[model samples]
Target: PQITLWKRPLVTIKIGGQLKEALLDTGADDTVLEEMNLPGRWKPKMIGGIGGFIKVRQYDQILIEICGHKAIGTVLVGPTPVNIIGRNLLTQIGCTLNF
Candidate 1:
């Protein structure tokens, strides 16, 4: 969906048979979602943040349904207030903007 950048380009993200919305940020490098009950062995990872790099968990087998589109991609988990979909997962989804 090529939506205009009037505000935030967020989309509904489904996990655990479906749940909640997420941010579609082209600038963000990794897909960071709010902490939840995610299955599988998560690896400890870090990404650039406000202070420097933030501690996050890496889930290689996360089944995400990005706005009705489904795919298995890398997901990062942390104490984030919102779900952020970055290029790691965003590129797989083939998302773009219009105007």
Candidate 2:
């Protein structure tokens, strides 16, 4: 399916057995989700965004389902305004942004 670029590439994701919405952000480099209760083990990480950076937890071998498509990769859990599916997970799912 093709998506129009006129608006933010917002879509629904399946996580925590709950339906959540995330942005397909090409500008972001890491897949960062809103702060939520995740697994026990994770790595301490600090990633920068548009103008500033924030401390987040990096969880490896994580799996996420998006609109029925499944992707297994590293995901970040931290304080974010919204969920952003970045290059890290996008590449895993073989997402191509083409006109």
Candidate 3:
């Protein structure tokens, strides 16, 4: 199915058995969540964005459901204004830009 790209492409995703609204950011290469209680051990990672850099907890093999599609990937948890689903998860859901 083709999805129209909105100015702010926001979608609902389920992670850690919790529902969250996330922004689909094509400009971002990885998925980022504001904060979550994840089970496994995570490493500290630094990410720079529009403003500056922030430290995040990088977790791998995270199960997330997006638009009824389920995908397992890496998710970075930190203090972002909003949750972002980037290319990593987008590619898994076969998302493509349509004009």
Candidate 4:
């Protein structure tokens, strides 16, 4: 059997010259991108979220693809974040979480 990447597609975020894919967490209220493995130019900024104020930055036209569909929009970047996929983006692309 092929490895199921869960019901919701693993979302990918590109920043600071790096591309990182993280599990889509629909339960989250805001889309989050972490800088765990970010490259040069990644700066830490404090931002507000459902989990309270956090360190993050903002991006424009972040390419999002899943369930055979693709989209692009602005998103917030964070550091050491859990990388949530939020409902706003999920609903638009008809996403369903797995496990």
Highest lDDT against the true fold, candidate: 3
**Number of the top candidate by TM-score?**
3
Q: Provide backbone clash counts, one per model.
A: 0, 0, 0, 1
Candidate 4 off by > 4 Å: 1-19, 36-52, 96-99
RMSD of each: 1.7, 1.3, 1.2, 5.6
> How many clashes in candidate 4?
1
Q: Give candidate 2's TM-score.
A: 0.90
Cα lDDT tens digits, model 2, 2-68, are 7788888899987666678999888888789999887669999999867799999998877888778
TM-score of 4: 0.54
lDDT of 3 by residue, 9-66 (tens): 7888999989999988888999999987889999999999778999999999999999
Predict model 4's lDDT versus the native: 0.57
Clashing pairs in 4: 45-56
For residue 60, model 3's alpha carbon misses the true position, in angstroms, by 0.3
Ranking 1 against 2 by lDDT, winner: 2
Query: What are the models' TM-scores?
Result: 0.86, 0.90, 0.93, 0.54
lDDT for every model? 0.81, 0.85, 0.91, 0.57
lDDT of model 4 at position 23: 60
Cα lDDT tens digits, model 4, 70-96, are 656545676644666666566766666
Cα deviation of 49 in candidate 1 (Å)? 1.9
